């Protein structure tokens, strides 16, 4: 037929529009500013007790409590300041690969190879943590989940789809389709109206939560996208891929802005996160280290070493005070 | 120093630590088996010879040893993105039906089921996450394979075959064909067994293979190996 020809000419038109839009380059524009210097942080706290591989962590909105998910079927809630354990939730399925902490602080979500997103209530009158909901409907593993509010959650799965749920009813209010490969991560915009997802088809997509349709599609990675995170401004996001590069995409410009790669680095990125100002882009790697990049210069600015295995997750507090990194060696480290 | 509520919180954290350590001690005494194969390999038989919508966990006990067998047949997603979750598994049980050497895939794409099983076995055996993990290979439907082979020759799946159509000869040839895919023969061990539907010695075979794996792990731990 001719439909694929129409798709090809639309792609060529979009490529030409982006090229015309690409009047300059961020790297050459940022020559005027000065480098941030050698960023050198220390391990303030070492949270230990999972005794198994750690796949996910998430900070609380109060920047003090954090939840951590491990393969020994445990969700541990930590008081980061005092290293105390607040709760230890035993999971029904130990193959958890994601976790989230509600912005209000009342609920914690986790999901894994069981394809079910479990929502646990932390503020109960019985004094224990209990499963408040079990969202089912995905036909693949759950790779990420983020709370929008106290009653809405977005999940990404291995069935190449994302789903916006209603926790009270337990049904997919919205379904986002369009990815070809497995969706491995998602990031909510600060205004919560949009989110972005990266998939194994080496592409990222911008989704409108209310409309339930893809706004923009960003490409450029040669391999799977394992992590994604919004710039604090909300007008850009960084993708960490398995091709040993990180990339910065701008929503309005609809184009890649900058690439963070080094010849010495050949392993894939497992997690990315910005700093509060957005000047530092932290990326965890398979080489057991976490590189801190000058987000505006692309020059590496620091190295967080101290994990004996792959850095699987990392997050920056809302106030920007600390960075917590979990890893396959069953420890979390807090750097400042 | 610490306020009263701070000390009480510390005590609560200590009790949580005690419970976590007890749970880990209990879990470390468990044998983990990853069950793999094709759609009609015979996993539905190996289960229900062992135990009397994503991953399926089967729990059983044998001679004071606790086994957790994980079946990931439901997962239709990309295996590369979740296989490393089973890196520390004690053993892999691979199931394949002998009676599929002539049958073609359900898609009827002129692809032999036996060749697909061999390709999957090659992918799993020569995997970065499974380099020293022993594989307990099960060749299922032996009597059905006999019935199928007395009429049809094994040359349908293996045109290079230069032997007779005797059941023993063809079974040995198929076992050798599967075992030759083991690239690192010095480290990984492949245990092969034959059973169709009625043998009650499969749990004994798995127990023996797991005992050997535990002995090897203990030798590595003790510094003798």
């Amino acid at each position, epitope marked *: 037929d001719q439909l694929r020809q129409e798709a090809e000419q639309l792609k060529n038109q979009i490529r030409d529009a982006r090229k015309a839009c690409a009047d300059a380059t961020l790297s050459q524009i940022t020559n005027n500013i000065d480098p941030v210097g050698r960023i050198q942080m220390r391990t303030r706290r070492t949270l230990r007790g999972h005794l198994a591989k750690i796949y996910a962590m998430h900070w609380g909105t109060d920047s*003090r*409590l954090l939840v951590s998910a491990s393969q020994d079927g445990k969700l541990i809630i930590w*008081d980061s300041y*005092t290293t*105390n354990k*607040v*709760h230890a939730i035993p999971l029904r399925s130990s193959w958890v690969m994601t976790c989230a902490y509600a912005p209000s602080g009342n609920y914690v979500a986790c999901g894994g190879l069981d394809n079910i997103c479990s929502i646990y209530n932390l*503020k109960t*009158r*019985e*004094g*224990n943590v209990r499963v408040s909901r079990e969202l089912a409907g995905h036909t693949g593993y759950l790779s990420c989940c983020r709370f929008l509010d106290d009653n809405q959650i977005v999940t990404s799965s291995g069935d190449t789809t994302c789903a916006l749920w209603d926790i009270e009813t337990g049904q997919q209010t919205t379904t986002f389709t369009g990815h070809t490969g497995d969706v491995m991560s998602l990031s909510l915009a600060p205004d919560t109206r949009l989110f972005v997802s990266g998939a194994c088809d080496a592409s990222a997509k911008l989704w409108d939560v209310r409309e339930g349709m893809c706004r923009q599609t960003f490409t450029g990675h040669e391999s799977d996208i394992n992590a994604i995170c919004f710039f604090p401004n909300g007008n850009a996001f960084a993708t960490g891929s398995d091709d040993a590069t990180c990339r910065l995409f701008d929503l309005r410009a609809d184009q890649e802005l900058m690439t963070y790669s080094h010849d010495n680095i050949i392993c894939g990125i497992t997690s990315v996160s910005f700093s509060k100002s957005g000047r530092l882009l932290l990326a965890g790697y398979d080489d057991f280290n976490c590189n801190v990049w000058d987000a505006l210069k692309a020059d590496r600015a620091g190295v967080l070493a101290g994990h004996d295995n792959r850095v699987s997750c990392l997050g920056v507090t809302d106030d920007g005070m600390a960075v917590a990194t979990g890893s396959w060696d069953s420890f979390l480290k807090i750097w400042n | 120093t610490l*306020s*009263a*509520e*701070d*000390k*009480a*919180a510390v*005590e*609560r954290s*200590k*009790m949580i630590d005690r419970n976590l350590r007890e749970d880990g001690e209990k879990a470390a005494r468990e044998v983990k088996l990853l069950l793999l194969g094709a759609g009609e390999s015979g996993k539905s038989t190996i289960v229900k010879q062992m135990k009397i919508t994503g991953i399926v966990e089967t729990h059983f006990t044998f001679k004071d040893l606790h086994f957790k067998m994980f079946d990931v047949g439901a997962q239709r997603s990309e295996r590369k993105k979740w296989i490393h979750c089973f890196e520390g598994v004690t053993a892999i049980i691979f199931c394949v039906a002998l009676s599929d050497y002539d049958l073609v895939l359900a898609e009827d794409e002129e692809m032999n089921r036996m060749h697909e099983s061999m390709k999957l076995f090659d992918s799993i055996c020569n995997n970065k996450w499974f380099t020293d993990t022993s594989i307990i290979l099960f060749l299922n439907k032996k009597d059905l394979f006999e019935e199928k082979i007395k009429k049809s020759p094994l040359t349908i799946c293996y045109p290079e075959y230069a032997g007779s159509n005797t059941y023993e000869e063809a079974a040995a040839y198929i076992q050798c064909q599967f075992e030759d895919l083991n690239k690192r023969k010095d480290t990984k061990e492949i245990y092969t067994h034959f059973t169709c539907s009625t043998d009650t010695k499969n749990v004994q075979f798995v127990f023996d293979a797991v005992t050997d794996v535990i002995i090897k792990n203990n030798l590595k731990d003790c510094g003798l190996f």
Partner: single-chain antibody
Amino acid sequence: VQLVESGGGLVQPGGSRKLSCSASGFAFSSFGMHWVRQAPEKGLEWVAYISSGSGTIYYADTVKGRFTISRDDPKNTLFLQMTSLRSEDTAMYYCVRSIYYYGSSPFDFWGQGTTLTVSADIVMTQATSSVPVTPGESVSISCRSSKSLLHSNGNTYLYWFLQRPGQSPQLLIYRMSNLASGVPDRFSGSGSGTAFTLTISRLEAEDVGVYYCMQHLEYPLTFGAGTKLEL
């Protein structure tokens, strides 16, 4: 959530009684438990405390040695064995649950209490003992501490309790700023070290009762005198 006590009655001095409180509707083993007494015409008085898992046990000096607090988790029961009862041990005894972690709400639920009759360093001061009020107007109740309750970690350990006539006291505010769950937003707490205020805006008939301020900085666990409101 239910805590019911038994073992009260009339006792001659020098006798012994076992007060037993049975708990249901919550995870008993994960809660610390307190015994708190109520004199027939006086205010509250902390008696004993046993932590979750029985790790730590604390007693008041006036009951030291005579009283033994214990818990039996499988049966979800709390015991207070009292020996050589004096005439001042007559009171209504309440059993209180309290769980301690970051952001928890200790002393949130109180038992009904059992009546016992015997037939022969921090001082918390409430300035006023009785305040007549009318519905509709805001009311302020003041409490003062002989020692600053503001700990170095930033938490000021002051708790407010309200005892309605014929009912057990309930938690209103914990750590002098946090409103307990289920308490209307009319109640508010404020102040600084050694000077605290509880504000009841748009007072209603239900708010009539006795208001207590208690400190949790150390373990004498001293209560306030008790400010009573009338109509």
